[PDB]
Every structure is written in structure tokens, then in C-alpha cells.
């Protein structure tokens, strides 16, 4: 995340770091005792020797993987949305089953998911979090970062990212002048909006042209478009 600040401990208790072969490689969101939501491109090609994965929850600093605030689980199952197209970025969304359930604590707790016609209009200020790059060309922060970014209207998303076919299963967010964005390493993590005083997961960090660039808002898989698939894959 570029243009953000250190998150406090327990700030985003659904935020998870996906370690693979011992290293953070993507983020994800806890959506229940047993299930994670992430980006498909995070798990594509890694749906084989699952013991390489470790879901790290309640994490603040990567250097403090060992705190008793931290819960860590093996990943048992990976379910990539059937419409995923790695070339076009459509349906870049997947679910991961935790091998043993997590306990809900101060530091670990699922997020509510955006519904069908819950309204999230352009201009709305939402939050992103992750352990991704500080900037395009910055370093990787030890401590989890958070930033506030505004949602951008669908038509603008597509004008600004003509390199892609921007669909109804995507959203985008960022500032015209740039400076605040999700970057490499943030993929799979959350875009969450405060809605009637309740944190709700709206997007899954998916792709972008660079990070934090002027008129290049980051793009996110739109949670509300995958409601039924998410529901059915549960447990």
C-alpha cells in the first residue's frame, strides 16, 4: 500500500497474510471460521502441494509471526471461481479453506460481505490494507499498512484503464493525482467500507497499472458480484 500509514494491532482483524513456502505472497480476508476470500491470481498454479501455504491471521508485523495474538492455519482446499480468466482479469477471486477453524478473538474476526444492492457510490471513502510495496519502487513494510481511498465510477475506471476490459465484476479506487493505492504484495487483500457503522468487504485487491500513479486507480474484484458462488462454496 502506497500513501498509507501503520495499522494498529487489531485494526483489521479479518486481514490475513498468505505465506507460501515461508513468505508473505498475498493478502486475504477472513469471512468465517473456516474460509478465506482472496484473489485467484494469488492461488493460480499453487493449487497442488497445499502444505506450502500457511494462512497467518491476527498479524501486525511480519517479524512478529510468533505473538500469541497470531493464529496460523494450514490451507486444505482452494476454490478458484470458475469464470476466472488470468488473461483478462475477469473474476480474479478465490476461496481458501482453513484446515482447522480459527477462534474469534480481539485480533481475529471475519468481515461482513457486501450484498447485491447495497449502495457504494463513487466518491465514497473506503479503506485498503496490506503488506505490499510502499510505492511502485518502494520497500516492503514489516508492519501492516492501511490507507483511505475513494471509489471511482465504473465508466471512469474503464477510461482510465483502457488496457483492460473493465467489467461489472470489478471496481476501482484511487485519486486523480495518485499517491494512494494498493501495490504488488497487496493482491487478494481487502477493500472495505464503513456502512451504517459496520465494516463491509466490498472488493478484493486484484490488479492495476503500476501503483499510486496519477489517473491509474487500483482495481478490485467486486464482492457483491460473487454472492451466490461465495455462499455455495461455504463449508
Residue numbers in the entry: 795 to 814, 816 to 956, 956A, 957 to 968, 968A, 969 to 970, 970A, 970B, ...
Give verbatim excerpts from the published study on this entry.
Because of the unique specificity, enteropeptidase could be used as a tool for the production of recombinant fusion proteins. Especially the recombinant enteropeptidase light chain (EPL), which contains a catalytic domain, is of large interest to be applied in biopharmaceutical industry. Recently, the enteropeptidase from medaka had been reported to be a more effective tool, because of its much stricter specific for the D4K sequence compared to its mammalian counterparts. Therefore, we sought to solve the crystal structure of the light chain of medaka enteropeptidase (MEPL), and gain insights into the determinants for its stricter specificity.
The structure of MEPL displays a typical α/β trypsin—like serine protease fold. It consists of two six-stranded β-barrels (β1–β6 and β7–β12), either of which makes up about one half of the entire molecule. Superimposing of MEPL with the bovine enteropeptidase light chain resulted in an rmsd of 0.79 Å for the Ca coordinates. The differences are mainly located in the loop regions, such as the so-called ‘131-loop’ that connects strand β7 and β8. MEPL also contains, relative to bovine enzyme, an additional small 310-helix between the strand β4 and β5. Compared with BEPL and HEPL, MEPL shows much less activity for the peptide substrates with arginine at P1 site, which indicates its restriction for the entrance of arginine residues. In MEPL structure, MEPLE136 makes three hydrogen bonds with MEPLR213, while there are no similar interactions in BEPL because it is BEPLL213, BEPLY136 in these positions as well as the same situation for the HEPL structure. In addition, MEPLV209 and MEPLG210 with short side chains are covered and fixed by the side chains of four residues (MEPLE136, MEPLE163, MEPLR213 and MEPLR216), reducing the mobility of “208-loop” and strand β11 in MEPL. Moreover, we observed that the imidazole group of MEPLH24 could form a hydrogen bond with the main chain oxygen atom of MEPLG185, which could help improving the structural rigidity of “174-loop”. Over all, the unique residue interactions in MEPL may reduce the flexibility of the specific pocket, restricting the entrance of arginine residue which has larger side chain.
